[PDB]
Amino acid sequence: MHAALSTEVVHLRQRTEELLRCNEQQAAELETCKEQLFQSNMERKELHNTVMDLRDNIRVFCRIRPPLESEENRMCCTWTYHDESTVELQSIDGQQIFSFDQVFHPLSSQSDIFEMVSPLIQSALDGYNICIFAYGQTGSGKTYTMDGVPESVGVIPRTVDLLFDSIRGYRNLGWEYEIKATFLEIYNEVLYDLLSNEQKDMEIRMAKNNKNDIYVSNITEETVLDPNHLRHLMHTAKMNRAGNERSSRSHAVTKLELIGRHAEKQEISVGSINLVDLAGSESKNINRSLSELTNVILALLQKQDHIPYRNSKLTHLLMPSLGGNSKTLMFINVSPFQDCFQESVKSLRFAASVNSCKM
Amino acid sequence: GSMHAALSTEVVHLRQRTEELLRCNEQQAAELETCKEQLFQSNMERKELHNTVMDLRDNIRVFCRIRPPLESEENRMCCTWTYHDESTVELQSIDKSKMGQQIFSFDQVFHPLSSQSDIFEMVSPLIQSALDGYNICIFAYGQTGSGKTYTMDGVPESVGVIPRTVDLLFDSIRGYRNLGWEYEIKATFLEIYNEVLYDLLYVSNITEETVLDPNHLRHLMHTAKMNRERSSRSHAVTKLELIGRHAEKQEISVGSINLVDLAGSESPNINRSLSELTNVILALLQKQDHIPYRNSKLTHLLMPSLGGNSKTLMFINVSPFQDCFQESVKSLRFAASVNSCKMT
Ligand SMILES: Nc1ncnc2c1ncn2[C@@H]1O[C@H](COP(=O)(O)OP(=O)(O)O)[C@@H](O)[C@H]1O
Ligand SMILES: Nc1ncnc2c1ncn2[C@@H]1O[C@H](COP(=O)(O)OP(=O)(O)O)[C@@H](O)[C@H]1O
Ligand SMILES: [Mg+2]
């Protein structure tokens, strides 16, 4: 029937023109809401960085680890907690007292530690560079704090979990995030790729578009696809991760570069997270990176004019994440034992140098 | 025929475009729901972070409010208002750098079109903390006709800060009841004119009350409001002493909320209390050991709440009009000083 089709056409043109109206209306509403969301997120980002600055871009904590059951044969120093920020230690055979942003003790949990870290993940997603260090003498607890164990995972695994939850959430703001992951060791001022068997010469050079930024030539830089992929990469690197004189004396750096793209407004947001399990602080090139790292941190705090980031592999690698608006957290790991007393004091004296430098 | 064919084509295409546009209406509906929810979460987190910043800073808090022209005043000329961000506001005569400050940064600036609820949104955190033993003080400052009373009291159609505090107060309380805390609320209302105090129903002897329910307090609130060019020069104070009790442990929280709608700041011992407030702010900025809290009967009460910290919030109400310009600048330059006060 011609009339049935005709009257259906008329009906469908009505339907059509009214839907175009209910669509145009929705579209305008969606435009203004999106714009207010973007602005609101810039302001949220700003306030967040304000908090970070009010707490200090560079912060230092202490963490005294508990003895293991296999360590009862070892006597502990006498530890005294003057307050949340101040700890003192006494040789069991004149005062050694140290102030920190916060002191963590043997009962302090892995998540207690991560609470200091989680706000900075958001910072990384906001375009700020982050550095998280574990500092201290071999046996003090650097690796347990950074990697941890399956029953109690440390900073890195928790950082990954939070990174995926947050990147997921961001999709609703119109942002899409890449993660570039690189894993390396630094031993005797030479860089090693923890994702490769191959022997190669890796150099630290200026980034193509940012001369203040850096990149490592000939390194395996992975674009993360999903959590399974990143779990595989971390496992692999942990397997090749370091021999007493070399295990104790090699730095480990896990770098997660967050690259965020908002396609509609055509904006980017690049911020990286460097998670560093430092070489032991126990007393040429073997210790170059560590001493230069402490020099650089203190120099930044003293607002020193010129800073020789390139005096060592470590400081040069992390340079773009140390100066300026970058945030640093350093966990000074300490073992509670009398026979470590002298090294525990050396470690904690760096903290004191930091406090003295903050004014 | 050719007409059946042509009509067939027409309906097919129209069915396909109907299906498209309906598909697009669906995607848009979903994306809009998502976007609104995200705008809500982002705003909420923004408010939380802002409150955290104000605490860490521990300055006296300053919010600036520009009131909209009234239906009457629709033919009254306004000066030029520029807003550079959420906390920065500039005003220029409708008619220069050497002349001083025309650009003012505060904790928050409220547009003429700001709801009473938006105002309260950024004050409620301060009120909730009174329950934790702190002395709180919200006070409104500005020339007459700028919106002090409207901001604190409000009108029945859109209630102000003081009214909404009740809701927030009992609501927050009944969650402490869960914790095993017991709260009583002592209330007092008073007025100050020519350095003389009046009970509108430490300080003694003035009418007190122990509150039972929101209605009891809404009532006595109305009663005080009922008894108020002298209201233009009279200060209004409303204190709500919150006294919590736990028997395990034996601790008590004692914290209060003070709500002041000050006299007008316009250029006139008639307006002294106000002048001595100005002097106490000048003193706190000097951070000096002897401070003239006692040179007036308002600064005496606000002395407990003028230690110079983030537990004190000042609204700086301002009129949009050109004939109010000079008064508005004066009000703003003062508010700038207040925002710089941190002492105790
Ligand atoms: N906070 C802690 N709680 C429980 N065990 C810990 C803690 N810190 C370290 N350990 C244990 O003590 C040992 C030394 O830790 P490790 O990270 O190897 O020190 P480092 O890396 O500084 O040499 C590890 O076997 C680890 O399981
Ligand atoms: N934010 C506002 N929105 C709409 N009208 C307002 C607002 N603030 C004040 N008004 C109106 O303007 C007039 C002057 O306000 P008012 O609070 O009496 O000034 P003040 O108390 O500072 O002398 C009032 O009658 C009130 O109705
Ligand atoms: Mg280790």
Side-chain angles (χ1 to χ4, degrees):
Chain A
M1 184 70 212
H2 300 69
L5 291 175
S6 296
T7 191
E8 157 161 344
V9 146
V10 173
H11 289 358
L12 290 175
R13 290 187 182 277
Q14 278 158 358
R15 182 61 174 162
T16 271
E17 60 195 58
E18 88 180 48
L19 263 38
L20 293 173
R21 242 125 45 189
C22 302
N23 272 29
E24 252 151 30
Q25 207 70 337
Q26 282 182 330
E29 267 184 46
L30 194 47
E31 173 162 328
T32 68
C33 179
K34 277 193 213 186
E35 190 42 74
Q36 289 181 16
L37 175 52
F38 196 88
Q39 180 61 39
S40 171
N41 183 76
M42 269 163 63
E43 295 165 7
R44 192 277 314 155
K45 160 183 181 171
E46 190 60 12
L47 293 171
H48 180 91
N49 199 51
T50 310
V51 167
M52 294 303 109
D53 284 19
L54 288 176
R55 304 199 162 126
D56 299 340
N57 282 323
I58 301 179
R59 283 190 276 163
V60 190
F61 309 98
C62 173
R63 187 183 195 189
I64 314 310
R65 76 163 176 87
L68 295 180
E69 66 82 16
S70 63
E71 282 175 333
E72 271 162 341
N73 57 332
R74 297 173 65 182
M75 300 294 100
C76 296
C77 303
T78 302
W79 296 89
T80 312
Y81 307 117
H82 295 290
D83 60 20
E84 302 94 311
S85 298
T86 308
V87 74
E88 185 202 338
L89 83 166
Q90 280 176 242
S91 179
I92 64 174
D93 180 74
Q95 250 174 51
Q96 304 289 3
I97 187 175
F98 305 84
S99 282
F100 286 87
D101 285 86
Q102 190 165 339
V103 175
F104 290 100
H105 47 85
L107 301 175
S108 297
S109 66
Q110 292 293 50
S111 68
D112 283 341
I113 299 283
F114 190 62
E115 277 185 7
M116 301 297 94
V117 173
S118 58
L120 298 182
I121 277 77
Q122 172 65 251
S123 290
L125 292 167
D126 286 342
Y128 297 94
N129 290 331
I130 307 301
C131 275
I132 299 178
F133 298 94
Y135 180 108
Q137 100 181 98
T138 298
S140 56
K142 290 184 305 296
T143 298
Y144 178 88
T145 300
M146 299 286 85
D147 302 337
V149 301
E151 295 83 6
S152 282
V153 299
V155 169
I156 297 182
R158 300 176 187 264
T159 295
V160 171
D161 283 10
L162 180 59
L163 253 181
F164 280 118
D165 289 329
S166 299
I167 283 177
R168 157 116 176 183
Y170 256 108
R171 287 176 188 133
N172 303 130
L173 288 70
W175 288 93
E176 224 73 29
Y177 279 86
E178 257 190 288
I179 303 163
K180 302 282 195 178
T182 53
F183 309 75
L184 58 88
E185 278 198 345
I186 306 185
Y187 172 59
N188 191 78
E189 292 304 280
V190 163
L191 306 145
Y192 299 84
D193 183 352
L194 287 174
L195 290 191
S196 76
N197 296 346
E198 181 182 27
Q199 67 179 15
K200 47 176 171 176
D201 294 5
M202 293 187 297
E203 268 200 342
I204 304 174
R205 306 204 289 165
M206 299 174 286
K208 77 178 187 178
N209 267 333
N210 197 340
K211 81 173 184 170
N212 303 124
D213 203 349
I214 62 80
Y215 93 104
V216 191
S217 66
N218 292 123
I219 188 158
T220 310
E221 182 187 337
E222 288 295 309
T223 297
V224 172
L225 308 199
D226 50 25
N228 289 331
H229 188 209
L230 194 43
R231 263 169 222 132
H232 175 66
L233 295 171
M234 286 181 295
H235 176 255
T236 295
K238 179 62 174 174
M239 290 299 101
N240 304 346
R241 172 78 184 281
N244 210 323
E245 213 162 9
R246 181 178 180 275
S247 177
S248 86
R249 209 107 276 196
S250 64
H251 310 267
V253 181
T254 302
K255 179 174 186 170
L256 311 177
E257 179 168 38
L258 320 179
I259 304 156
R261 285 175 183 90
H262 199 295
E264 287 197 31
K265 289 218 88 181
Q266 291 283 289
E267 297 274 353
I268 56 166
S269 177
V270 187
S272 70
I273 300 181
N274 303 88
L275 302 129
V276 191
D277 189 341
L278 295 157
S281 38
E282 52 263 28
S283 297
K284 265 176 173 162
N285 297 14
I286 302 303
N287 290 273
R288 186 103 67 174
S289 281
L290 199 55
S291 47
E292 283 304 330
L293 174 62
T294 50
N295 285 6
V296 163
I297 291 169
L298 291 182
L300 291 173
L301 286 170
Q302 299 176 56
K303 315 255 222 213
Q304 278 199 21
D305 56 319
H306 272 143
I307 303 196
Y309 288 98
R310 302 193 282 150
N311 287 354
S312 79
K313 288 299 168 88
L314 183 59
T315 49
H316 191 180
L317 173 67
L318 299 177
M319 171 173 63
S321 299
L322 286 177
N325 271 328
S326 300
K327 296 91 175 74
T328 285
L329 298 183
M330 173 165 283
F331 291 92
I332 308 268
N333 295 93
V334 146
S335 53
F337 304 120
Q338 168 64 27
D339 63 32
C340 298
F341 174 89
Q342 197 172 347
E343 284 298 347
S344 287
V345 179
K346 278 173 169 156
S347 291
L348 302 164
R349 256 141 80 196
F350 172 69
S353 313
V354 168
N355 229 70
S356 161
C357 267
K358 286 170 161 197
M359 219 67 75
Chain B
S2 82
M3 180 47 163
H4 172 78
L7 280 169
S8 181
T9 291
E10 200 172 32
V11 290
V12 156
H13 288 45
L14 276 173
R15 274 158 176 176
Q16 328 206 299
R17 183 178 180 81
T18 283
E19 197 163 45
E20 279 165 14
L21 298 177
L22 195 69
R23 182 172 61 84
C24 170
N25 200 87
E26 268 144 7
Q27 305 314 322
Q28 273 178 351
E31 184 170 5
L32 173 62
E33 175 221 312
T34 292
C35 198
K36 267 156 166 280
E37 243 302 311
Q38 285 303 321
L39 178 57
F40 174 90
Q41 293 179 203
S42 162
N43 261 255
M44 188 186 88
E45 185 172 1
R46 197 177 45 74
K47 290 178 185 298
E48 297 176 4
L49 281 168
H50 189 201
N51 226 256
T52 295
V53 160
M54 288 187 270
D55 293 341
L56 270 42
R57 276 172 63 89
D58 215 33
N59 293 87
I60 302 187
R61 284 133 114 127
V62 186
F63 292 168
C64 171
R65 198 189 188 170
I66 318 282
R67 84 162 167 92
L70 294 180
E71 72 285 354
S72 308
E73 299 161 339
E74 55 182 345
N75 200 18
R76 182 176 182 185
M77 193 193 295
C78 296
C79 37
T80 307
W81 298 91
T82 318
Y83 309 97
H84 298 288
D85 56 38
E86 292 297 322
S87 61
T88 301
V89 57
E90 174 179 10
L91 79 162
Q92 297 293 351
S93 179
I94 203 163
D95 285 31
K96 248 300 193 176
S97 187
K98 248 75 157 96
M99 316 290 191
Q101 214 186 342
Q102 301 291 312
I103 302 175
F104 303 89
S105 279
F106 295 127
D107 290 308
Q108 174 68 37
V109 168
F110 286 108
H111 200 254
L113 293 174
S114 284
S115 42
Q116 296 287 66
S117 180
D118 275 41
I119 297 272
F120 199 70
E121 245 170 12
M122 297 243 72
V123 181
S124 66
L126 208 43
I127 268 132
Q128 285 175 32
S129 87
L131 290 159
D132 294 332
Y134 292 108
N135 253 53
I136 314 298
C137 172
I138 316 286
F139 65 99
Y141 183 102
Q143 79 175 116
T144 303
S146 62
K148 289 182 302 299
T149 307
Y150 180 99
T151 297
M152 302 306 284
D153 283 11
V155 292
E157 59 185 346
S158 60
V159 298
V161 168
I162 296 174
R164 307 170 180 272
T165 283
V166 161
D167 307 331
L168 182 57
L169 197 51
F170 290 100
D171 279 326
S172 303
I173 271 176
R174 256 291 167 75
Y176 281 65
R177 250 89 157 146
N178 181 319
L179 289 192
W181 276 94
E182 292 177 17
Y183 279 102
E184 85 162 83
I185 294 144
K186 288 187 186 169
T188 56
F189 317 99
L190 66 115
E191 200 179 321
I192 311 181
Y193 180 79
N194 216 8
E195 296 303 334
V196 175
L197 305 85
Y198 310 79
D199 56 333
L200 298 189
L201 305 158
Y202 66 74
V203 175
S204 179
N205 46 4
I206 291 303
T207 322
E208 271 256 48
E209 267 270 343
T210 304
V211 184
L212 284 71
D213 57 23
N215 290 34
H216 178 197
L217 184 59
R218 300 174 191 256
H219 182 256
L220 262 88
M221 251 168 194
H222 166 77
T223 294
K225 180 180 181 180
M226 277 223 57
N227 308 10
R228 186 175 180 175
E229 276 195 356
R230 46 177 65 83
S231 180
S232 60
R233 305 298 207 169
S234 91
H235 314 251
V237 186
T238 293
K239 191 237 278 168
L240 308 184
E241 183 161 19
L242 323 185
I243 301 177
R245 266 150 192 154
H246 216 163
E248 53 281 56
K249 57 182 178 178
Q250 186 63 58
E251 62 171 347
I252 72 170
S253 291
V254 160
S256 55
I257 308 178
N258 295 82
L259 302 158
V260 182
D261 177 8
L262 300 168
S265 73
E266 65 265 29
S267 288
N269 71 76
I270 299 68
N271 252 71
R272 188 172 298 274
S273 273
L274 191 131
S275 188
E276 289 304 328
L277 172 46
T278 298
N279 297 132
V280 174
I281 290 318
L282 279 160
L284 280 162
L285 275 185
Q286 299 298 321
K287 293 175 62 177
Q288 60 188 30
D289 189 13
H290 304 315
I291 296 170
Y293 293 107
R294 298 171 63 80
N295 299 20
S296 69
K297 295 181 177 180
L298 174 82
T299 59
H300 213 156
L301 279 53
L302 281 59
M303 172 177 74
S305 69
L306 264 172
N309 67 352
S310 70
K311 265 50 177 210
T312 298
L313 160 59
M314 157 187 289
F315 281 94
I316 169 74
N317 298 100
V318 144
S319 298
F321 307 113
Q322 175 69 31
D323 63 26
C324 283
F325 187 69
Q326 292 187 36
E327 270 320 315
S328 282
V329 172
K330 211 226 298 167
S331 299
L332 289 169
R333 303 196 174 169
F334 171 64
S337 296
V338 171
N339 210 19
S340 290
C341 290
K342 66 169 315 207
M343 178 72 180
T344 63

